[PDB]
Amino acid sequence: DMYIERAGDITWEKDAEVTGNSPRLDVALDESGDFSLVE
């Protein structure tokens, strides 16, 4: 049996750690809601 616990406010933080790249991927989405890379 699942339950929820508060973890914080939803706010934009100025001066947060900036990381991660921005790739352009060819993807497909199936009936089960699962993504796959199209090649």
Binding site: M2, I4, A7, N21, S22, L29, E31
Partner: protein
């Protein structure tokens, strides 16, 4: 139970100890999370019960107590923040520039940040703090890293 706006952890006492299976957003009395986190099952908030209202396996989304409320969208240009809530760790804002998932039905924003499976449902924000989608449904690229779609629902 608790209906205050904010980010929440989705926990389960069905395995060893208490285990974080996902994350969700409480907004306008509606809890929003990813379908694969709860599988559409009922949630508990202290004493109160939360019953599913709308859900869809293909979109991989589900709402509790009312219709989907989150309608903001990525502008295709500016940086965003992932308010990542990882298991056993404090909520943390990570700023990134999203990439693109190009599909047969259109382009979707994508965040290339790697986190444990229990982080599924963590919100993605714009500069105004508006929830533009949830993190947790994506793919593994040829170098083994994880890229998640910016998954947003429709507000009726």
């Amino acid at each position: 139970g608790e209906t205050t706006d904010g980010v929440y952890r989705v926990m389960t006492r069905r395995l060893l100890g208490s285990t974080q299976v996902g994350v969700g957003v409480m907004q306008e009395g509606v809890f929003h999370t990813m379908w694969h986190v709860t599988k559409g099952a009922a949630l508990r908030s202290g004493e109160g019960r939360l019953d599913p209202y709308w859900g869809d396996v293909k979109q991989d989304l589900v709402s509790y107590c009312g219709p989907w409320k989150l309608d903001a969208a990525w502008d295709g240009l500016s940086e965003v923040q992932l308010l990542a809530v990882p298991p056993g760790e404090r909520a943390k804002n990570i700023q990134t520039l999203p990439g693109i998932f190009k599909t047969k039905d259109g382009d979707i924003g994508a965040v290339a940040l790697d986190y444990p499976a229990g982080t599924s449902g963590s919100p993605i924000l714009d500069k105004c703090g508006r929830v533009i989608g949830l993190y947790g449904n994506g793919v593994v690229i040829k170098n083994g890293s994880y890229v998640s779609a910016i998954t947003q629902g429709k507000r009726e």
